[PDB]
């Protein structure tokens, strides 16, 4: 099927050029504005541009030629970049996810992990380690001539050699680890945010109780209603203090409630109302600030939740079929090779999968908009 590679890699060599540079510039604005995601976005954009720039020669040869029109030993230099692109993509997505989970979950451990130099060192170590991992077949040209055909490099239908274990290791370590890591990160984020919602519920209820009792005492026809409502005010104030300088305000509030209780208890009506009016100023000048702070704090954790979920979804859609098919092909070879019908059926499937998984290029810029926007 000579349609899928040309068209899809046309889209990648197209819509990829101007989005990635804008993402580069935007997260450069971010790195100068004291942030840690921008460096990872720098590395991602660099790898993206490198791979998309490797693409056009490939999109050149297939469209009109059918026998590799460049050097026979030239195609060897165009698989290393592809492998590095894919696996640096998964690595950097995993790093972003775990860093954001660490930030949202444990601020104390996140301390000294928010330093930009730490992120730069981590990125440099990741680049060096991936280069060391991908330097396997460049050193030995015999390893290249193992499974690349004499020309039109499409691997070999006789998959003979240590490939059956190379590719099994690839589908295990390279796909199954980061997927599980980010799954655990998403689970932790969800648990923390749900707990936060449960915590804010009762504080809101306590504020409601206080305001309703204040409304009741504002009239206070007799002296029994004053005490009856002030008891529930006291209980709600103690509960609200338990839920959480604001403790000083709660102390003052409880003291003034007790003052009103005593004044209404001696057998008067008006002095309790005067204390009730006095209560308003400390009600709306101490606790409302922390209430607003908690309301504002919840939304950032919600943002982090949906960022983690989007990252998981992208890493699923981009890479699962190709690695699954590689595992299937390795497992089939490891058993009885007399059944080549499996390979007959999965030939075009596996080529289609390996050509499909190129959309990290086009999906990586779009995740920047789920954090501070501007590149697109």
């Amino acid at each position, epitope marked *: 099927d000579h349609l899928f590679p040309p068209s899809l890699y046309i889209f990648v060599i197209g819509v990829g050029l101007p989005t990635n540079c804008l993402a580069l510039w935007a997260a450069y604005r971010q790195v100068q504005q004291r942030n840690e995601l921008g460096v990872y976005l720098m590395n991602l954009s660099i790898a993206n541009l490198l791979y998309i720039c490797t693409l056009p020669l490939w999109v050149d040869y297939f469209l009109h030629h059918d026998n590799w029109i460049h050097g026979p030993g030239s195609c060897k230099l165009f698989g290393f970049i592809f492998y590095t692109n894919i696996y640096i993509s998964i690595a950097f997505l995993c790093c972003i996810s775990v860093d954001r989970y660490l930030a949202v979950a444990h601020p104390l451990r996140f301390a000294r992990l928010r330093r930009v130099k730490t992120a730069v060192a981590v990125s440099s170590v990741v680049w060096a380690t991936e280069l060391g991992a991908n330097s396997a077949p460049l050193f030995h040209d015999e390893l290249f001539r193992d499974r690349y055909n004499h020309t039109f490099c499409f691997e070999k239908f006789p998959m003979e050699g240590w490939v059956a274990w190379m590719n099994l290791y690839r589908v295990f370590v390279g796909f199954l680890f980061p997927w599980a890591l980010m799954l655990l990160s998403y689970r932790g984020i969800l648990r923390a945010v749900r707990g936060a919602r449960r915590q804010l519920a009762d504080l809101e209820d306590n504020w409601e109780t206080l305001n309703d009792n204040l409304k009741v005492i504002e009239k206070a026809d007799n002296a029994a209603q004053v005490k009856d409502a002030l008891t529930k005010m006291r209980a709600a104030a*103690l509960d609200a203090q338990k839920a959480t300088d604001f403790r000083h305000g709660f102390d003052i509030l409880v003291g003034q409630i007790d003052d009103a209780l005593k004044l209404a208890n*001696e057998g008067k009506v008006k002095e309790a109302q005067a204390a009730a009016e006095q209560l308003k100023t400390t009600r709306n000048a101490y606790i409302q600030k922390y209430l607003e702070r908690a309301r504002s704090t919840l939304q950032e954790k919600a943002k982090i939740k949906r960022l983690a979920l989007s990252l998981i979804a992208i890493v699923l859609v981009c890479f699962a079929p190709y690695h699954v098919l590689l595992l299937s092909r390795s497992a089939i070879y490891l058993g009885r090779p007399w059944d080549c019908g499996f390979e007959e059926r999965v030939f075009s499937a596996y080529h289609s999968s390996l050509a499909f998984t190129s959309l990290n290029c086009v999906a990586d810029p779009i995740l920047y908009c789920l954090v501070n926007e501007g590149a697109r």
Partner: antibody
Amino acid sequence: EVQLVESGGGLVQPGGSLRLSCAASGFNVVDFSLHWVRQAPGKGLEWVAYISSSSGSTSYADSVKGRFTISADTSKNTAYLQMNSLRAEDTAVYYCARWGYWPGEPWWKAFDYWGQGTLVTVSS
Amino acid sequence: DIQMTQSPSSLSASVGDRVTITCRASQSVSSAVAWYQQKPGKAPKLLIYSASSLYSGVPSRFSGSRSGTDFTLTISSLQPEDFATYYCQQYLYYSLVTFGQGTKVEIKR
């Protein structure tokens, strides 16, 4: 440690009068609030009265209003409880409690210290 | 006033057993419930304050919990000296103090 000794009385006649005295040792009554708790023969515990020497506010239970009076004397560091119009339902053992003020932990400890007990018998 | 109700009026247990006693409020008090112990002819002794918080001097086997207008006292093992009466009290404010009914623990044979 601080101790609360109850020196009251026994064997008053119906309609008689009595006065109890809850002497305190160690602490100062100007720092705490003094309550009263009584236990009927083979029954539960009940609340009687409350005073605050500092503030001056005083509160009473339903059954002991108009008949009992509580006054804490700062000079003698002793609380008091005057009993009048005694009936036979007041035959019990009377305890004197001790409760702190609101700032901080003292309020959350409750009746950390009691007395020994005094026995009042209203009989004819 | 706020009422307080204790579930078991009596309890027949042997040594080494585990015992739970529950006291229930009526108006959703805060963690303002205390547990006492009274023996024949003696003043009550405080055990737990603020729903579940151990006193300064008391054996560590006693415990408590709060679940919202629901308070529980537990003993892991009944030593021979833990056969007495127990009470629950709420102390929201000075004029609002109420006690429980009382629970007695005895021997089984």
